[PDB]
Design a protein around this ligand. Structure first.
Ligand SMILES: Cc1cn([C@H]2C[C@H](O)[C@@H](CO)O2)c(=O)[nH]c1=O
Ligand SMILES: Cc1cn([C@H]2C[C@H](O)[C@@H](CO)O2)c(=O)[nH]c1=O
Ligand SMILES: Cc1cn([C@H]2C[C@H](O)[C@@H](CO)O2)c(=O)[nH]c1=O
Ligand SMILES: Cc1cn([C@H]2C[C@H](O)[C@@H](CO)O2)c(=O)[nH]c1=O
Ligand SMILES: [Zn+2]
Ligand SMILES: [Zn+2]
Ligand SMILES: [Zn+2]
Ligand SMILES: [Zn+2]
Lengths: 158, 164, 158, 164
């Protein structure tokens, strides 16, 4: 059966490039892959249900970025992929800027065979110990809106 | 601040032993610990609600250890956050999925909060490989239901779906 | 084929109890184990060559504590166990008190399928960040002779 | 002090990509990095001896990244220790074993120094499972010998011993 690896951590944690590390292993192994993102080729989809459109009978790897943005229906969708022998690799955020769990990421962490926690550089103190995202301006965006911080700095800042 | 470590995996994956390894590091390092379990031996306080923990944590407590977290109220998520913010490291061990492969919610919340996650494997009861990630029930389709070998077996995904 | 897991870190890192976590998985799985230590049952042996005396045709797990003290001949001995389908789990020290590599542990880390790095509590600063052992009085012994420290404290102390 | 992370595994296990993920974290965090490679693109300095590194590390360097460490002189062990003691985090990627399953000594020394070790898997060239841990040579029984797909293949232990 397939194995599920979940990569997670705050923003600016190298999660996408880490997921791409796995994509490269499969392509190098001459294995068929399917890559997804929410709204080589990454298929932009909106619902998890839509992945079965793009999965082939010889698809071996399925890679999903930004999993926080998907419906929790992804849990059961991933489970079925695993039961078919398809390896799944997911990246996304574990917590919101309010330190509430992203529900979909949480379900996947529970399902995972392996979990990789990535850290970022703390925006405030400059150490390689950042595990949280602080919001400074669901809301898409980047360094103009979110910074990565350690727990100590978060608490000093909010 | 404190870090949170979560140890998870199916039954029979040596999760309690793993947690006790960490208790030991703090016991050898001269630090006050609190060990808790829900309503596995070193003087664990038995507690019903997570907020009952505050009572047992003194000003010099440096580590808080919690077994079988799947049985705790999800309000554990906020209680753990508070300890972390106070500089208390927390180590948790629990089951990640039920026998029906549904997530345990308290466990899943703590997984999202964790700084480090240790996923543990068990021996597959049917095939005997070191690859079992799921717990199958074998003697009631109730999700919360105490027991040992007489009621639950650890399996890999393939043997799970074969036995289902 | 077998898989090799190596547990390592400084003294007072919970390495023995972690190795025993694995021993318990096999015994619970009703699997035959063989446990070793250098000079349930742990067989006290002096050389790696002596392990083949105690390994059965249905031995599935082989557990080796204090691997720093074994001859580097253990590398090839472990390799052959793996090729036979026997899972191997080893614990021991990565560095001496002078921060020189323990040669046998180093060879095993290179062979390992999984490496677990354990930390201890720093004797000087009290944080859970100790990765080194400082000597304060090959030389067997314990807390009367060695303490665990973080790199910063080691360097302050030596 | 600085921490050392070592990424290792056989060929085709995405080790360089893994290392670049860490380079990125420091690039997004506004910190000076130094990337090095022996005599894989972001402006890596090409160096013959490890001690040639000192030249390229300025007073505000917070991370030092080294690809293909198996090719460096073992005197890298002492050079890395010095950076760590100076508060510079170091990330290293290299092969753990030769094609004959002998350890690479520079890699093994750094493995013992590491605070964190990331073991990476490749796809097995023969069986196609996500479980390959070894590199087999397929086109000279020399241990140090440059090449790609034309000369080395990644395999699991079973397929290695089958092809041997
Ligand atoms: C941290 C966080 C990020 N995001 C978004 C911002 C980014 O576009 C994306 C993470 O790359 O997630 C939220 O919607 N909410 C949050 O709380
Ligand atoms: C797997 C599983 C275990 N349990 C119990 C069995 C044990 O008494 C305890 C696990 O240590 O969890 C449940 O209540 N439901 C389940 O689905
Ligand atoms: C750290 C260290 C430990 N040891 C011994 C002390 C203990 O008896 C054993 C580790 O438990 O190793 C050495 O011989 N040399 C060293 O440098
Ligand atoms: C596996 C292996 C690789 N190499 C080289 C091949 C590549 O040029 C480089 C790995 O990135 O290492 C050796 O020199 N010897 C070996 O045994
Ligand atoms: Zn900070
Ligand atoms: Zn099985
Ligand atoms: Zn210290
Ligand atoms: Zn193979």
């Amino acid at each position: 059966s397939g194995k599920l690896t979940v990569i997670t951590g705050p923003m600016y944690s190298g999660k996408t490039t880490e997921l791409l590390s796995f994509v490269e292993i499969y392509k190098l192994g001459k294995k068929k892959v399917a890559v997804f993102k929410p709204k080589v080729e990454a298929h932009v989809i909106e619902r998890p249900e839509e992945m079965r459109k793009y999965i082939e009978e010889d698809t071996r790897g399925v890679f999903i970025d930004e999993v926080q943005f998907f419906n929790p229906s992804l849990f059961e969708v991933v489970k079925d992929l695993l039961d078919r022998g398809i390896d799944v690799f997911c990246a996304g955020l574990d917590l919101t800027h309010k330190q509430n769990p992203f529900e979909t990421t949480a379900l996947l962490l529970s399902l995972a065979d392996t979990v990789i926690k990535k850290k970022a550089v703390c925006h405030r103190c400059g150490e390689y110990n950042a595990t949280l995202t602080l919001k400074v301006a669901i809301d898409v965006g980047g360094q103009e809106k979110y910074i990565a911080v350690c727990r100590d700095c978060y608490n000093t800042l909010k």
